[PDB]
Design a protein around this ligand. Structure first.
Ligand SMILES: CCCCCCCCCCCC(=O)OC[C@H](COP(=O)(O)OCC[N+](C)(C)C)OC(=O)CCCCCCCCCCC
Ligand SMILES: CCCCCCCCCCCC(=O)OC[C@H](COP(=O)(O)OCC[N+](C)(C)C)OC(=O)CCCCCCCCCCC
Ligand SMILES: CCCCCCCCCCCC(=O)OC[C@H](COP(=O)(O)OCC[N+](C)(C)C)OC(=O)CCCCCCCCCCC
Ligand SMILES: CCCCCCCCCCCC(=O)OC[C@H](COP(=O)(O)OCC[N+](C)(C)C)OC(=O)CCCCCCCCCCC
Ligand SMILES: CCCCCCCCCCCC(=O)OC[C@H](COP(=O)(O)OCC[N+](C)(C)C)OC(=O)CCCCCCCCCCC
Ligand SMILES: CCCCCCCCCCCC(=O)OC[C@H](COP(=O)(O)OCC[N+](C)(C)C)OC(=O)CCCCCCCCCCC
Ligand SMILES: CCCCCCCCCCCC(=O)OC[C@H](COP(=O)(O)OCC[N+](C)(C)C)OC(=O)CCCCCCCCCCC
Ligand SMILES: CCCCCCCCCCCC(=O)OC[C@H](COP(=O)(O)OCC[N+](C)(C)C)OC(=O)CCCCCCCCCCC
Ligand SMILES: CCCCCCCCCC(=O)OC[C@H](COP(=O)(O)OCC[N+](C)(C)C)OC(=O)CCCCCCCCC
Ligand SMILES: CCCCCCCCCC(=O)OC[C@H](COP(=O)(O)OCC[N+](C)(C)C)OC(=O)CCCCCCCCC
Ligand SMILES: CCCCCCCCCC(=O)OC[C@H](COP(=O)(O)OCC[N+](C)(C)C)OC(=O)CCCCCCCCC
Ligand SMILES: CCCCCCCCCC(=O)OC[C@H](COP(=O)(O)OCC[N+](C)(C)C)OC(=O)CCCCCCCCC
Ligand SMILES: CCCCCCCCCC(=O)OC[C@H](COP(=O)(O)OCC[N+](C)(C)C)OC(=O)CCCCCCCCC
Ligand SMILES: CCCCCCCCCC(=O)OC[C@H](COP(=O)(O)OCC[N+](C)(C)C)OC(=O)CCCCCCCCC
Ligand SMILES: CCCCCC(=O)OC[C@H](COP(=O)(O)OCC[N+](C)(C)C)OC(=O)CCCCC
Ligand SMILES: CCCCCC(=O)OC[C@H](COP(=O)(O)OCC[N+](C)(C)C)OC(=O)CCCCC
Ligand SMILES: CCCCCCCCCC
Ligand SMILES: [Cu+2]
Ligand SMILES: [Cu+2]
Ligand SMILES: [Cu+2]
Ligand SMILES: [Cu+2]
Lengths: 241, 236, 382, 120, 153, 77
């Protein structure tokens, strides 16, 4: 077994670090695959970071892994950082790829290929879970906040890119000029799923409406993925495959 | 002794090999690797594909066969100290699996959000594909299968039955590799847009979700760690 | 570099690029190179390709080795997707600024919303200098000049690092104590209610309140600075002005067209009727980025890519001048190594063995006529 | 079918069957039918247009209820690279066959239930 | 026009259909236009009498490989042969397993205790032979059908 | 009463109404008022709006305070 109390503590600490590595990087791989194949195109390009589609889609598809990892970590260890660790791992993988491949392999500027910020939403989700340990309360209030705070959290980053520019007779934002100048051979402009205006777009409501829709759908997706993570935690021994 | 320096090798081998792979693809991405019908493409990326597939098959066969042949027959007469050492070795295997999963499913996958988004595909064997699906995926599949086999053949907790969370964690991410068929079919036919979030990607996603079974796998390994040498100290 | 893999018949019948010109073949960093030409949208647009209702004038290149300074269809700038009409001919102009040193194969391409990339002829353009010398200045309507290479980079890095640090601080705060196995045992064996106690709840409340307050304050500060912002400008642009070409005075009827399998030549029999009032002669056959020239009639001087140019690849059985009103039938053979290099011979693999192209007819004075031909392409094996 | 059955009997694992045997079931379909349909793919010069023998069969033998456009067949795309149409379709079919086999194993498990629903 | 075509609303087109008689009788022949998303548009129909015997009908065609075949029976023998061969292989597999008792004794053996007795060598050897022979025959048949008919579209 | 909220550029480039006329400005119950004019469909029709392949000539009003007796495009009902 173990020699003494001290050696047990040291063994537990070593296990803690190794299992933290395993959790963090398996989450990085799986969450990054899910994110980049469910929100990657908006996350890739500043001229894709719009007010309708980016704000709508990103929190909805990104609340998935935080819900499951929360439902496991909080329930089994009272560790209230499942959402934070998921978001940090996604950001780390995204930034590594942006710097070494988007800017390293290809030579797209970082101010063009930067990822979105998600830590505020993750922190809200984690704190709202730890306080008032109710998973239902988390799914309703914390997911609401996660959806709502996405665009305001990223506004300090993308606001300078929205300064209007008179570009060769046409009005363009700085992000628009970035997308125009830095040629993406595989990504023509029409692929861009961004706000284009509708006849039923009343007043200045595009960003808040998208944020509230994303918050509601985030509630729904969090509710689903809490139980998905509950299943993924199963310790069953399927006798034969 | 307990946890030994096999963990350092587990990290370093993947780090060094994938850094060299990244250097190789940085050197031969353009300039023998843009035109899939050029003769230099055959010598620098098709040969890479052939060699890597053969080496992956050989390495998987050898590693899995050795792990299964050296399986512990007398698991009953295993001391708690030896069980703790084997649990640490299995944790090293899981660390290697996590590192390989990162390299495969994050780095080289999004590295494509960087290759195609920039070039016009020329084939189902983009040099990067010759890196992601035919390396960043078989390598982590081999590591996951090896970790599962080691758990089953050395840990009494993971013996006497197939653990469902471990099986999911090991096989689901494997299903991403045959899912490449859906990727190809739904790139050439369905969807000519380079949309990364196209439904032709819900195939790595669905099976990327199965990696969440690492949570059940890890609580199982925690219980296996805390069998005889659980303490005391912990809960005392 | 992405063609030679697409279907031969689809490359033949989507868009015909001609009158292509390049301002320079070798450039310095920050120097501008302009690509001009015309493209004609083929009438027999394949049903598998969506109609070019939404199309984008793109550049085929290995990443931003050039930056697209300007692009025009007709005479007007087209930074967004545009609508093209089948059967119309448009003139285009793309202005590129060199950014990365090296030898780059630059293609002019048209991306169609539901059909994918239509790659035109590519030309090798040499860039010399250093990437560090590249500048992309732009002046905003707020009266400030910024360099797009590094503008907002510091702010982006700062905010991302700040939020990452906040998350790492949260995780480390909870990670100072033992993490996995003792906490799992405490939760399992009896009620836990001991690993989360004040001031842990106070720290979490502080984290939540600080996160919300910092987000609000940062948004307000980013609104006070940059008080003038506009949304992303998007939307397909209609009313592209096509070229008003004169009606051709030459009518050509294709009476069968064959190619040998295997081979590097394509043979077709044409009935050419000369209207107007000048003797014409067949000078060129363009099928898919490949120009087969009758050197005795016409010579290329626009610096067309050599691997796509067949200087004497067009052989006409009787290419004597065709008097006005006269109709004759000739055997036309287009033969060049390009026919196999660019896999135009692989139309045998295609599910639609039909070709399309452009015939260029030249008279004595030098003025030229463009006529379009399309017919089934029948392989011959014996 | 033979591949699916033998891969199940050997290595009785249903998971192994769903992964390997279904892969083989999807992959061997087109090569298994090639000896039958290959003679029908001989090219024919038919009234100025290139047509396969199967194409001429469909043209000649009139199906009043089945016009040609209903035919969901390969028509070519701008993203069809080289000679890959058949293998790509075969591999996609094999992967989807793995998925469908996995689903229908449990569907058949349910359909085998010997329960006595006391009242309907 | 052996394939689908595009028509323009408001335009007038002239058409010509050539039919070869195949089956005797009195047939109401309509010229019709099928539209992708609207269904059949049937034109006027005319009674056309066909006399003779169906056995006299021929549908010759000459391929680009220089052979003349009759579309009425071309490849019929090959299709029948291959289908019968594969059906026979499957029936042989089933009968091999069906020589022994099938349902109730095997069910009882599986239920009452571990079975591990109804599938024993050389049953595994026979199954391995079946699998290997199936794969090898498929590969050989594909190669043979590629050597013959080397030109296909 | 439903405009002033739609996007300015979409109101500018969809349909231009001109030569508008109203037969009467004040009417009795059961009395008829006729609205005439011309509208031009803009060539630069926004891509976010579907092409007017299916369009209906409607009246903007707060419920059936009037009944639409007739409506014509060209000269036909
Ligand atoms: C603490 C309690 C008191 C505060 C109560 C707040 C009431 C609403 C404030 C509106 C702000 C404003 O100004 O209107 C709305 C502003 C735009 O404004 P505008 O451009 O002027 O719109 C012009 C038209 N108007 C003059 C009539 C406003 O954005 C929006 O369209 C927001 C739309 C959100 C829709 C989804 C909401 C879902 C709620 C779910 C609840 C669980
Ligand atoms: C638990 C609830 C937490 C809520 C935290 C809110 C922080 C403050 C946000 C100010 C937004 C702003 O300034 O106005 C709205 C703007 C969009 O404006 P825009 O017209 O598209 O123009 C964009 C250019 N700007 C910025 C120069 C004008 O931003 C948003 O899209 C945020 C929408 C969600 C608001 C959530 C608060 C409403 C109540 C929520 C509870 C039911
Ligand atoms: C049960 C839920 C109760 C929540 C009560 C609401 C708290 C609001 C806090 C202040 C937010 C703010 O002031 O900012 C919200 C901004 C306003 O944006 P704006 O007007 O376009 O421009 C910026 C103008 N500023 C700079 C003056 C703010 O974003 C939005 O458009 C979202 C507004 C919709 C809110 C819908 C709430 C519905 C509640 C229903 C209860 C029965
Ligand atoms: C899970 C089991 C995985 C099995 C697959 C492993 C794939 C290995 C690479 C395939 C190469 C190929 O196929 O190409 C063969 C290449 C082609 O380059 P060259 O033209 O000869 O140029 C000269 C070679 N340079 C360009 C590399 C300088 O040359 C070689 O011989 C060199 C291959 C070296 C691989 C071993 C080093 C890896 C980093 C160190 C830490 C491990
Ligand atoms: C038992 C349940 C299994 C069923 C699955 C079988 C595969 C379906 C094959 C569709 C063929 C068809 O039906 O038609 C084919 C249609 C015809 O369209 P087109 O006119 O050529 O459009 C031209 C547009 N191109 C040029 C881009 C093709 O192409 C399609 O739109 C393909 C639709 C995608 C269906 C596949 C989704 C797979 C889900 C994967 C998520 C994990
Ligand atoms: C025993 C181990 C060693 C053998 C390893 C085999 C490596 C690949 C061989 C390619 C043959 C060839 O020739 O390329 C591919 C041939 C066509 O060839 P092409 O027309 O010349 O293509 C021109 C372009 N090129 C020159 C770059 C090849 O078909 C295909 O597109 C097949 C595409 C399959 C996609 C889905 C695969 C899913 C795999 C799932 C795994 C669990
Ligand atoms: C357990 C795995 C069993 C695999 C059994 C394979 C038997 C041999 C098949 C030869 C095919 C051929 O000849 O090439 C490919 C051709 C299609 O060619 P095409 O270009 O469309 O032209 C058609 C006209 N032909 C025939 C005159 C050229 O056939 C196929 O569509 C088969 C595609 C699936 C191949 C599976 C093998 C690859 C590895 C599988 C494991 C990951
Ligand atoms: C874990 C899975 C391991 C499987 C290894 C591959 C075994 C291949 C057996 C020979 C097949 C053959 O030779 O035939 C396959 C044919 C080739 O067709 P072709 O090149 O177009 O023309 C015919 C040319 N011939 C006549 C010379 C053959 O069909 C295909 O296109 C399918 C090729 C894609 C294979 C993808 C394998 C990916 C493995 C990834 C491992 C990490
Ligand atoms: C009817 C729905 C209205 C909203 C109420 C939903 C909350 C229900 C959550 C629940 O089931 O109870 C879990 C904890 C129990 O802790 P207690 O030991 O009851 O603590 C009571 C003292 N306290 C007021 C500081 C909390 O109690 C809490 O969850 C926290 C209670 C304080 C409310 C504010 C917490 C949420 C902060 C965003
Ligand atoms: C994409 C969807 C996510 C996959 C999750 C589905 C898992 C379904 C559960 C399952 O596999 O059941 C196993 C049974 C075989 O049972 P046994 O082997 O008798 O095990 C006894 C205990 N047990 C009955 C509770 C399992 O049924 C069997 O016949 C064995 C099949 C086991 C396959 C499960 C592996 C899934 C990997 C993708
Ligand atoms: C180039 C390929 C080299 C792979 C080398 C494989 C090493 C052999 C695997 C192995 O059995 O164990 C190696 C180490 C230490 O564990 P061991 O104790 O040696 O394993 C047996 C346990 N037993 C002694 C009690 C019977 O266990 C480990 O943690 C080794 C991890 C290696 C990382 C995985 C590399 C796989 C790359 C495809
Ligand atoms: C490709 C997709 C995989 C499908 C998933 C099915 C496998 C999942 C369950 C599993 O791994 O169990 C098989 C054994 C574990 O022991 P058991 O299943 O109890 O049976 C041991 C006897 N047996 C080795 C013949 C199977 O594990 C082993 O013995 C594996 C080591 C022996 C294989 C080495 C040869 C392979 C070379 C390529
Ligand atoms: C880690 C994944 C790698 C692949 C291994 C997956 C196979 C697992 C299947 C399984 O759970 O075990 C069932 C049988 C058990 O039979 P055993 O009594 O263990 O027979 C051992 C002697 N043998 C090598 C001839 C089989 O053992 C077998 O299923 C057959 C084992 C021989 C492998 C080749 C069989 C498949 C032929 C296509
Ligand atoms: C298309 C979907 C496939 C259909 C499969 C669905 C079957 C659902 C199972 C079911 O029918 O449950 C029966 C119960 C009534 O229970 P009881 O009649 O009390 O039987 C006692 C034992 N039992 C509760 C386990 C049934 O619930 C009831 O109220 C009786 C309804 C029974 C209807 C089942 C017949 C299905 C034929 C299509
Ligand atoms: C946790 C993942 C780390 C990925 C780092 C990476 O991709 O490195 C390649 C990149 C390549 O850029 P550079 O360092 O300038 O060297 C260029 C060499 N090539 C072109 C072959 C990559 O930078 C490095 O090699 C830094 C070493 C980091 C060690 C963890
Ligand atoms: C879980 C959500 C899945 C929604 C599917 C989707 O977004 O499909 C879009 C696509 C619409 O095609 P579109 O986006 O217009 O594609 C444009 C590019 N082409 C024409 C080449 C495909 O619809 C389909 O073809 C059916 C998808 C079936 C999903 C099981
Ligand atoms: C759509 C979410 C369904 C999640 C399945 C969980 C099943 C748990 C059974 C123990
Ligand atoms: Cu090129
Ligand atoms: Cu044309
Ligand atoms: Cu009004
Ligand atoms: Cu107008």
């Amino acid at each position: 077994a173990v020699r003494s109390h001290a050696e047990a503590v040291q063994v537990s600490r070593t296990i803690d670090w190794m299992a933290l590595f395993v959790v963090f990087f398996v989450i990085v791989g799986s969450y990054h695959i899910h994110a980049m194949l469910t929100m990657g195109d908006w996350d890739f390009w500043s001229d894709w970071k719009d007010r309708r589609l980016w704000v709508t889609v990103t929190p909805i598809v990104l609340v998935t892994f935080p819900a499951a990892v929360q439902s496991y970590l909080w329930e089994r260890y009272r560790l209230p950082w499942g959402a934070t660790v998921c978001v940090l791992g996604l950001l780390l993988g995204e930034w590594i790829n942006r710097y070494f491949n988007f800017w390293g392999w290809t030579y797209f500027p970082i101010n063009f290929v930067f990822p979105a910020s998600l830590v505020p939403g993750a922190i809200i989700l984690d704190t709202v879970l730890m306080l008032s340990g109710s998973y239902l309360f988390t799914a309703i209030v914390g997911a609401m906040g996660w959806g709502l705070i996405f665009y305001p959290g990223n506004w300090p980053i993308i606001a300078p890119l929205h300064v209007p520019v008179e570009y060769n007779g046409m009005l363009m934002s700085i992000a628009d000029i970035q997308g125009y100048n830095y040629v993406r051979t595989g990504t023509p402009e029409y692929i861009r799923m961004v706000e284009k205006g509708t006849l039923r777009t009343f007043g200045k409501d595009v960003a808040p409406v998208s944020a509230f829709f994303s918050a509601f759908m985030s509630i729904l997706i969090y509710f689903m993925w809490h139980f998905i993570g509950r299943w993924f935690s199963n310790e069953r021994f399927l006798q034969s495959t | 002794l307990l946890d030994k320096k096999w963990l350092t090798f587990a990290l370093a081998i993947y780090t060094v090999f994938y850094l060299w792979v990244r250097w190789y693809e940085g050197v031969y991405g353009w300039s023998a690797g843009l035109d899939s019908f050029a003769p230099e493409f055959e010598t620098y990326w098709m040969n890479f594909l052939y060699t890597e597939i053969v080496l992956e098959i050989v390495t998987a066969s050898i590693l899995w066969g050795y792990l299964w042949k050296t399986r512990d027959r007398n698991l009953a007469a295993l001391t708690p100290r030896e069980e703790l050492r084997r649990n640490f070795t299995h944790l090293v295997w899981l660390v290697a699996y996590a590192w390989a999963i990162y390299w495969g499913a994050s780095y080289f996958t999004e590295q494509d959000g960087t290759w195609h988004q920039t070039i016009v595909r020329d084939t189902d064997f983009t040099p990067s594909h010759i890196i992601e699906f035919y390396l960043s995926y078989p390598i982590y599949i081999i590591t996951g299968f090896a970790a599962f086999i080691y758990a089953k053949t050395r840990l009494p907790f993971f013996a006497k039955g197939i653990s469902l969370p471990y099986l999911v964690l090991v096989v689901g991410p494997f299903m991403i590799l045959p899912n490449v068929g859906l990727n190809e079919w739904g790139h050439t036919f369905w969807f000519m847009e380079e949309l990364f979030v196209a439904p032709l990607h819900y195939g790595f996603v669905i099976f990327g979700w199965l990696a969440l079974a690492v949570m059940g796998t890890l609580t199982q390994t925690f219980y296996s760690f805390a069998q005889g040498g659980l303490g005391q100290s912990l809960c005392e | 570099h992405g063609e030679k893999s697409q279907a031969a018949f689809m490359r033949m019948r989507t868009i015909h690029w001609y009158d292509l010109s390049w301002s320079k073949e070798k450039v310095k960093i920050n120097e501008t190179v302009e690509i001009k030409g015309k493209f004609h949208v083929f009438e027999g647009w394949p049903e598998t390709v969506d109609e070019p209702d939404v199309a984008f004038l793109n550049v085929g290149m290995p990443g931003p080795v050039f930056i697209r300074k300007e692009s025009y269809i007709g005479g007007q700038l087209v930074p967004r997707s545009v609508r093209l009409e089948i059967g119309k001919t448009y003139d285009f102009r793309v202005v590129l600024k060199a950014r990365r040193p090296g030898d780059w194969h630059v293609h002019t391409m048209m991306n169609v919303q539901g059909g994918g990339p239509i790659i035109g002829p590519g030309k090798w353009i040499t860039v010399e200098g250093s990437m560090s010398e590249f500048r992309n200045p732009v002046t905003t309507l707020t009266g400030q000049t910024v360099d797009l290479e590094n503008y907002n980079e510091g702010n982006t890095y700062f905010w991302h690092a700040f939020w990452f640090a906040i998350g790492v601080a949260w995780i480390g705060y909870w990670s100072r104590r033992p993490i996995f196995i003792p906490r799992l045992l405490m939760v399992d064996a009896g009620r836990a209610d001991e690993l989360v106690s004040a001031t842990d709840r106070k720290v979490a409340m502080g984290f939540l309140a600080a996160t919300i307050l910092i987000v609000v304050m940062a948004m307000s500060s980013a609104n006070s600075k940059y008080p003038i912002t506009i949304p992303l400008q998007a939307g397909t642009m209609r009313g592209m002005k096509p070229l008003e070409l004169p009606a051709p005075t030459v009518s050509v009827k294709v009476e069968d067209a064959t190619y040998r399998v295997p081979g590097r030549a394509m043979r077709m029999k044409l009935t050419i009727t000369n209207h107007g009032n000048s003797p014409i002669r067949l000078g060129e056959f363009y099928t898919a980025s490949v120009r087969f020239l009758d050197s005795d009639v016409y010579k290329d001087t626009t610096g067309y890519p050599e691997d796509l140019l067949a200087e004497d690849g067009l052989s006409v059985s009787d290419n004597s001048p065709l008097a006005p009103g006269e109709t004759r039938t000739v055997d036309v053979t287009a033969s060049d190594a390009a026919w196999e290099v660019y896999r135009l011979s692989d139309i045998i693999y295609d599910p639609d063995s039909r070709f399309a192209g452009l015939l260029f007819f030249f008279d004595a004075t030098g003025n030229r006529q463009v006529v379009q031909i399309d017919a089934p392409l029948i392989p011959s094996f014996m």
